[PDB]
Design a protein around this ligand. Structure first.
Ligand code: MG
Ligand code: MG
Ligand code: MG
Ligand code: MG
Ligand code: MG
Ligand code: MG
Lengths: 168, 168
């Protein structure tokens, strides 16, 4: 529904420039905890859909942003079974298993610790997205190196440095 | 010479608070290119000597900062053989070999590309420090994992994720 998305775009694009900036997108997003939507997550989302290195999305690009965030909301709403604004370790295990990840139970505690900005041992919507984006990017890199598909990689000193340099 | 360092500390500590902030240290440092001293390098240096998580150094901690930066200046001044403000690949090879690193010729191009903010294919003083801090930290992690000291490591999927999570 382009007519619906256009009216949304106009309300988010507060400076009426035709480009939604990081700050404009952040102000339009709720993370369900009454704190600012994780600005790293916002930057990740804008960068994924901005095809012009302009630190923002135009209307065509925003239609993708809106579907992306809506799809994420639908996943999170499914697994936040108590409507608390955060999913717990068991719910995170189910959600990531639904994406196809193969992760030990104990690694889910590591993931929550790494990405939960609230510090309560559960994970809110904005931090959930960011953790999943990172997990996909890191797993993609591992899949490239694991050419024998055994779950293990072997790398030299300089291969390891180059691998880290590709990450950060 | 505490009397000399005290007078330096007073001039850098512009707000006269007894704590030199990141911004105060940055304003006191020249990177020899007439651009602001790399703020990542400044943050790395403050964090290394601040024992109190106060985003700054007191006078005792600053005596360490001053010796640290002075030691780095002495290394860089040695190898900037044309007094240009930047060292080239050959000079970088010598400097890092002097620190004990074992790096192929081609990896020095990778290092320069990764850390040279000026974009000229050489490396200035502030970027040199930051690259060396990162190289030490990453090599330290590799040394921990390379228990057979052969220059190769083998890691599982979850070991790799945990390793990356320790880096960034
Ligand atoms: Mg705008
Ligand atoms: Mg919940
Ligand atoms: Mg393998
Ligand atoms: Mg001060
Ligand atoms: Mg030079
Ligand atoms: Mg080994």
């Amino acid at each position: 529904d382009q007519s619906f998305l256009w009216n949304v775009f106009q309300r988010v694009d507060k400076d009426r420039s035709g480009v939604i900036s990081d700050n404009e997108l952040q102000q339009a997003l709720s993370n369900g905890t009454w704190t600012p939507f994780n600005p790293v997550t916002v930057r990740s989302i804008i960068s994924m859909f901005d095809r012009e290195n302009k630190a923002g999305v135009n209307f065509s690009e925003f239609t993708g942003v809106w579907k992306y965030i809506t799809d994420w909301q639908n996943v999170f709403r499914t697994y936040d079974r108590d409507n608390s604004g955060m999913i717990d370790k068991n719910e995170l295990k189910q959600a990531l298993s639904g994406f196809g990840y193969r992760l030990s139970d104990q690694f889910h505690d590591i993931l929550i610790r790494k990405f939960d900005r609230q510090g309560r041992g559960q994970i809110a919507f904005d931090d959930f997205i960011q953790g999943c984006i990172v997990l996909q990017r890191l797993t993609d890199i591992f899949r490239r190196y694991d050419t024998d598909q055994d779950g293990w990689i072997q790398v030299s000193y300089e291969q390891y440095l180059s691998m880290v340099f590709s990450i950060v």
